[PDB]
Design a protein around this ligand. Structure first.
Ligand SMILES: CC(/C=C/C(=O)NO)=C\[C@@H](C)C(=O)c1ccc(N(C)C)cc1
Ligand SMILES: [K+]
Ligand SMILES: [K+]
Ligand SMILES: [Zn+2]
Length: 365
């Protein structure tokens, strides 16, 4: 009925403690609260993930290792080499607790979807799609997206994962690569030297999971209109061929114009239209956050997207709240595209969509 919003003051504090950008969860929640959107959702206190719950995807050796180097901040452990710790993913003190809360918040939201508590569950602090079963990658130590999907596997036999982050959700695609129960769809920037380096259109999975992985390689400077047409064409084809019963959606904000990544040229409006097309499926939807390195932009994006889920049209003027001064110099909710060219050739885009049409033919047949 009413969208579940995963939040507790203790959870946000935990998320700000070891965040990449300081006060990541604070700003996003403070702005949502400022628009009084929390009063129209069902606020649910997240439960910290147990060792067994994480073990549904991650190996035991890896989990024990995190717990050991997290209590003292041992960034010099001789077993860290095996698990990808920790140059890109530092072995900072209390990192396992940080991952436990966020991992447990996605599972909690998934549990609300199972028990029929709602049709939509939101966790903006979640959605780290890079982590592997026994390896940390790209700031991700625990793949909370996979943990969420595995929780939904208790009720749903057809789960669709849609990744709209700037980067390819490799950790999630790799997790369900050998299965047809979960189809992963990832729209991302794909160029040599760009992280994580995988996710070409020819990457369709392995074994019995072949053709159940879908990748859309996109180039720099793409804007709302062209992006949506790509997203609509893929999701329409996938919905018919896969027939999902539940949806997990990762909405990273590193695609938005004004992000330090400086790749895609998106505004929250474009992603909003993508979210609308998925919401009208009337399926149990698990909304996750993701990447983003422009704090105020992330807040503007995810706050607007929360308004989309609720159907509310938000005021263009940023209301006075705790972090109001961070929204200079215009102090508005809208985000304007930068003056950069679109390097996506209309023929290559159509050529990719045709591959996907060809690959999904195998699924439906
Ligand atoms: C891991 C990642 C994003 C993942 C993501 O967004 N997953 O969703 C990006 C890495 C490769 C990167 O490009 C980078 C660039 C600059 C930088 N500093 C200037 C500190 C730190 C990292
Ligand atoms: K993506
Ligand atoms: K798959
Ligand atoms: Zn990203």
């Amino acid at each position: 009925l009413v969208p579940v919003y995963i939040y507790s003051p203790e959870y946000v504090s935990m998320c700000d403690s070891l965040a990449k950008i300081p006060k990541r969860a604070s700003m996003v929640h403070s702005l949502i609260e400022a628009y009084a959107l929390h009063k129209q959702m069902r606020i649910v206190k997240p439960k910290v993930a147990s060792m067994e719950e994480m073990a549904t995807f991650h190996t035991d050796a890896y989990l024990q290792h995190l717990q050991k180097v997290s209590q003292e901040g041992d960034d010099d452990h001789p077993d860290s080499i095996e698990y990808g710790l920790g140059y890109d993913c530092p072995a900072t003190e209390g990192i396992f607790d940080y991952a436990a809360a966020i991992g447990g918040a996605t599972i909690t939201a998934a549990q609300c979807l199972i028990d029929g508590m709602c049709k939509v569950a939101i966790n903006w602090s979640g959605g780290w799609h890079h982590a592997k079963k026994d390896e940390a990658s790209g700031f991700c130590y625990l793949n909370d997206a996979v943990l969420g999907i595995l929780r939904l596997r208790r009720k749903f036999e057809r789960i669709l994962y849609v990744d709209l982050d700037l980067h390819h959700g490799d950790g999630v695609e790799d997790a369900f690569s050998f299965t047809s129960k979960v189809m992963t769809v990832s729209l991302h920037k794909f160029s040599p030297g760009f992280f994580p380096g995988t996710g070409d259109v020819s990457d369709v999975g392995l074994g019995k999971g072949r053709y159940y992985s879908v990748n859309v390689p996109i180039q720099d400077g793409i804007q709302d209109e062209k992006y949506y047409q790509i997203c609509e064409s893929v999701l329409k084809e996938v919905y018919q061929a896969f027939n999902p019963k539940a949806v997990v959606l990762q909405l990273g904000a590193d695609t938005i114009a004004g992000d330090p990544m400086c790749s895609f040229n998106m505004t929250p409006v474009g992603i909003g239209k993508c979210l609308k097309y998925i919401l009208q499926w009337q399926l149990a939807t698990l909304i996750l956050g993701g990447g983003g390195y422009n704090l105020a932009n992330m807040a503007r994006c995810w706050t607007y997207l929360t308004g989309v889920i609720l159907g509310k049209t938000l005021s263009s003027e940023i209301p006075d709240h705790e972090f109001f001064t961070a929204y200079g110099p215009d102090y508005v909710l809208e985000i304007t595209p930068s003056c950069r060219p679109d390097r996506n050739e209309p023929h290559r885009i159509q050529q990719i969509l045709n591959y996907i049409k060809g690959n999904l033919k195998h699924v439906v047949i």
